[PDB]
């Protein structure tokens, strides 16, 4: 079968698997930090550098992945934690997204919350604007920020999160699991037919923003991902 | 919330936390073997001590788990392979089925491959008497060994395969994701409602069975899970 | 660490994973076809789409890696042998080699038998030209095609081969092991300073060509790559 | 050519290939472990039965060759890791090492650390009495385990480790390949004149030791060899 896997558990610029889209800054000690913190709507992206091709026009088959990731946004004295961070899937065309302002696009849609990709966001701060749960939530945003479903999640700062991601290729669900610092699990899960809303050739990657008044540090500790197509 | 969550890198018999019902035998480094390759008909099965209460007649609500684990399987000259191993849920007076012979009930069910039970099988001998596909294959079976789901798998003797479960609340989504020792991972996902088909307390556990002209090495390397059940 | 590995055990067009340069043809098997029978002067790369930076100007580090393949040449009614296959690194921006005729430069230089690359080949027909040892061999070439260092070798028609290919980091010792159908094994081994021949990011893959009288079908049936680059 | 091949994926006591010397014991799982949990200064080695003639005193030659191998060293509660696993050569008539204590000889020297054997060893415990490098090494022992060379490298208890070894007859060039659980892989190289060491026949295999307070699981689970002797 045709496989794709990687790992990170660490960073440093200059890598050629990894494509830095924004204020992206690699710490001195391979961490990934998404935002910067002294700028008014930062934005920032971190892409797998090679489009993944996740099914075939001519097999009308769609792969499978494994992916698991873990990261942290710790607060700043004097300042809104946001936007959060956000794992996403898009065309493999796929630019960086017009920095917002007050804004929540979480640095892949426009002003109204449009945008082409598919993916899982860990939202800390509520927009009347985008339908945002009244609190800290996690959800499945398909071509918008407004979320698909969502499901209430509590984001601790300094903590160090666990994620665990699930994609079938038949049932086509997407089933995620985040593991929080003091043991308790949160998941939820959507169907989304791939094949439906992403071009042949996509790409993955982890995506953040921030307002005016909103910011946090959003950092991406570590990454795994395999996916796998039948092809036969 | 309330949240069960454990971890085996290494087994020991007389750990109070780890029930031994049948064939099963603990070797020197840690590893559980749960049949007995001179015997006829062996069962064996491992169960996690402790009920966990998955769902609560009060609230309404079910647990949310995210167990990952390790076997492996290895061939012994002049023998067909069987009958695979099983990670199973039962109601928490669940004893061991009787042994059977030719069968291939994986040591959960009757000569007829009835039994009260929901788990994923990882089978690797056909048996037209429960529907076995063709060949190898991953499943997810509800009170029968005659899966209710199945997708093709292959079973490399001697190879260490990790798999990741994952159960949503709320979309009472079962979705496994097995990876092999190429790299390549097979995932399978099935609805099932907790609720409906087990009583609010239940145990985990893996089992295995051999057969007269069926027999292999079942070796359960590591376990780590955790479930989470919200009650407010 | 930084690391890259992939496994294919077969091949399928349209795989962003990999850059069909030349006459290479994808066969309805998984297999991959070199060259073209029915050309004078065919010439056919493979190589693995995404650049691996081999070494870091930052750190002054140099990555080792583990490359293991698998390839098949078989003969064709009157018809030279010729010209082999060759696994080889170049220049991430690696543009395929001008098609030659009765020459020999294994796709990867000039009419003279120059070029910028390192690689390991797999010679089946001598040319004075390039200092051809008198029969089939093995051997280590770094900018030329005129061999660093040459070992006899003897190509089989329809034989399957397994290579094993190892380099040290510090040593900077590049080992090959050729298994053959028999079973015996040939090996060479040479010091290459990849940091001084090649730049930071190259192209890792298998390349080929034949001639107006030399011609033979060329099939890369598998491939593993892993490397890793200590950055710390 | 003169070759030597064979290939064991699996063990058990009874083989006529196989010599046992130490406390050596054969899983239920044709699995090999070289030392005895329940003893002070414990030691096991396994030995290819047959010896291997690597060079001709007619033909000045030296024969090449390529041998992988998979092992696991789990820990056990209340214990130091050590001594860790060793690949060898030796002069045919090698007897079992005298039995240390506090030592960590690795089965294959005297209480000094002297001995006439050539290896490779997967040390993960350091003695000041040996040179033993702050942490974890892979070393290239000549006649001593006090390592000609070594390397850092990082044991992982539980985790089944694939090295693969190629010596080129020529350049006398042994080389290693070290394949961790995450995917990242070690390597060392070294000249060792098999011909100046090693008398004309000699046996391969894999040694362990223990000590009072330092001791683990040494599991050998695969082992394949090919040697190839030029002679004419
Ligand atoms: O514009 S301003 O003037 O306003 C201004 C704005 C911001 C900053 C800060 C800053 N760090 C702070 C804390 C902090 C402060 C106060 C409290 S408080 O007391 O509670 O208030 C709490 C926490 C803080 C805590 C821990 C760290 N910073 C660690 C760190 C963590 C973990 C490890 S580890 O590995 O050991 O785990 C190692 C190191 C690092 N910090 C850097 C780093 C850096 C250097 C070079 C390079 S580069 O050149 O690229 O290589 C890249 C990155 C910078 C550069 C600027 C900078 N850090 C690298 C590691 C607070 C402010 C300075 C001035
Ligand atoms: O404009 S303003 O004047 O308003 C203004 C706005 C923002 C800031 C701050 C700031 N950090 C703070 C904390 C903080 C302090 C006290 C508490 S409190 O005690 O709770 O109150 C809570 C939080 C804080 C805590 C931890 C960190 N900061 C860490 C850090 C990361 C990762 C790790 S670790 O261990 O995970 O690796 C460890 C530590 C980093 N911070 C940077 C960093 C940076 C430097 C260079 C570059 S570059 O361009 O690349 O050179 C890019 C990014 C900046 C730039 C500005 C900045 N940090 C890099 C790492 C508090 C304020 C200062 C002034
Ligand atoms: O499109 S978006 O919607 O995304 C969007 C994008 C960008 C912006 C902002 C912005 N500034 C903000 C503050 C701010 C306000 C309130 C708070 S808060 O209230 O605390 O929260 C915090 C921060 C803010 C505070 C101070 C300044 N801005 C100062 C400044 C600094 C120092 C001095 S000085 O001299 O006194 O030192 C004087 C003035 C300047 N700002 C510019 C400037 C500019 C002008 C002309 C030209 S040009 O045409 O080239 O000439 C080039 C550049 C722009 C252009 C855009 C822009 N500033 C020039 C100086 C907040 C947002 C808004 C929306
Ligand atoms: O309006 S008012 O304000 O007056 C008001 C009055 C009462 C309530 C409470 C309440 N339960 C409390 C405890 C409690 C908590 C902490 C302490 S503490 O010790 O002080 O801390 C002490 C006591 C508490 C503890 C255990 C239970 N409740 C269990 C239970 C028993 C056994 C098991 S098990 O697993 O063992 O079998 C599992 C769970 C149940 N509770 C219900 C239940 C119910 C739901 C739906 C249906 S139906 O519609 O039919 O579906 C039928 C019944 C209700 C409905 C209202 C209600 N419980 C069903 C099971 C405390 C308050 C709220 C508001
Ligand atoms: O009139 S007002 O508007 O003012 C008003 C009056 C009453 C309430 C409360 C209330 N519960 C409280 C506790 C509480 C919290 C902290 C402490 S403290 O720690 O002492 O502080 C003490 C007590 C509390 C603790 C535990 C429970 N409640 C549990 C419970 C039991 C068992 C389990 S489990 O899982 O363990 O089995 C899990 C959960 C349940 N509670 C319900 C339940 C219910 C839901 C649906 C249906 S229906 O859909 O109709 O069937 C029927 C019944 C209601 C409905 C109203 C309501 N509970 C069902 C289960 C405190 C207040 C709110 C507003
Ligand atoms: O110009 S002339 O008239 O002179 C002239 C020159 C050359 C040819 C031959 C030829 N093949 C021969 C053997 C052969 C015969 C007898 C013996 S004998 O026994 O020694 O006698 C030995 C060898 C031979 C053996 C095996 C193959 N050919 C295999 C093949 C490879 C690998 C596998 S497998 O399974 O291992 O992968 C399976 C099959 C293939 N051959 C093609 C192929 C092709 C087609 C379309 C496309 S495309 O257009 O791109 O789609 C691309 C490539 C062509 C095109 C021309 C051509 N093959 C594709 C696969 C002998 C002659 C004919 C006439
Ligand atoms: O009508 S019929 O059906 O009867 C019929 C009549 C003639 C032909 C042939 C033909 N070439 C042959 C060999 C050959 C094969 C085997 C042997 S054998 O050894 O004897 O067996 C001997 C010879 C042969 C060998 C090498 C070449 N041909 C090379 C060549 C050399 C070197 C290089 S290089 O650069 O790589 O060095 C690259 C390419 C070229 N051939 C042309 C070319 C051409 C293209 C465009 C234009 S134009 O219109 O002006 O644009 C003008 C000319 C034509 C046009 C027709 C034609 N070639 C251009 C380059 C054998 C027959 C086919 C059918
Ligand atoms: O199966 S068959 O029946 O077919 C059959 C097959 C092969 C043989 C031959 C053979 N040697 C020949 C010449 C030869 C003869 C005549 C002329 S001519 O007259 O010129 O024509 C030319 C050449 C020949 C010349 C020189 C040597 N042989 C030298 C030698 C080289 C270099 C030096 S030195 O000092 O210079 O280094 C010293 C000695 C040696 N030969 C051996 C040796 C051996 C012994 C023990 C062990 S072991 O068991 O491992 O201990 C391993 C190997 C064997 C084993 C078989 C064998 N040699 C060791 C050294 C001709 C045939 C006989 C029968
Ligand atoms: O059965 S068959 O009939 O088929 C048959 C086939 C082949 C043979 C021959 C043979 N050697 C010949 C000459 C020769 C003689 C005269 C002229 S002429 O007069 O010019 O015509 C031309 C050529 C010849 C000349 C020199 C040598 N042989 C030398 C040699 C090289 C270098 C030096 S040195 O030290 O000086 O450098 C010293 C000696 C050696 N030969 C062996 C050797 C061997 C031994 C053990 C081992 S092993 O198993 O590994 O131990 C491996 C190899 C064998 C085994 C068979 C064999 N040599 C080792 C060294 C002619 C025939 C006999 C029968
Ligand atoms: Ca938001
Ligand atoms: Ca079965
Ligand atoms: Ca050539
Ligand atoms: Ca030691
Ligand atoms: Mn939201
Ligand atoms: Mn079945
Ligand atoms: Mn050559
Ligand atoms: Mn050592």
Redesign the interface.
């Known amino acids: ?7 990170f ?2 960073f ?1 610029e ?4 990894i494509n830095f889209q924004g204020d992206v800054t690699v710490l001195s000690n391979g961490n990934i930090q998404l935002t910067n913190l002294n700028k008014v709507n930062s934005v920032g992206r971190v892409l797998y ?5 996740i099914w ?1 026009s ?1 097999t009308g088959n769609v792969a ?3 992916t698991s990731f873990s990261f942290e946004m710790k607060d700043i004295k004097d300042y809104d934690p946001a936007d959060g961070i956000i794992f996403f899937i898009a065309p493999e065309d796929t630019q960086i997204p017009a920095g917002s302002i007050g804004g929540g696009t979480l640095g892949v849609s426009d002003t109204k919350g449009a945008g082409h990709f598919v993916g899982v966001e860990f939202d800390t701060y509520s927009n009347s604007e985008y339908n945002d749960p009244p609190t800290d939530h996690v959800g499945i945003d398909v071509n918008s920020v407004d979320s698909v479903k969502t ?1 209430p999640w509590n984001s601790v700062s300094g903590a160090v999160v666990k994620v ?1 991601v ?6 086509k ?1 997407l ?1 995620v ?1 985040v ?1 929080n610092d003091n ?8 169907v989304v037919d791939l094949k439906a809303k992403l071009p042949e ?1 996509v790409k993955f990657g982890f995506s953040a923003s921030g307002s005016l008044g909103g910011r946090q540090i959003h950092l991406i500790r570590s990454w795994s991902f ?3 197509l039948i ?1 036969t």
């Open positions: 079968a045709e496989t794709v896997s990687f790992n558990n660490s440093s200059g890598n050629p698997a550098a090679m489009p993944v091709r075939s001519a499978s992945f494994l499901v665990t699930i994609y079938d290729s038949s049932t669900t089933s699991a593991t043991g308790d699990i949160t998941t939820i899960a959507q050739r395999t996916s796998t092809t």
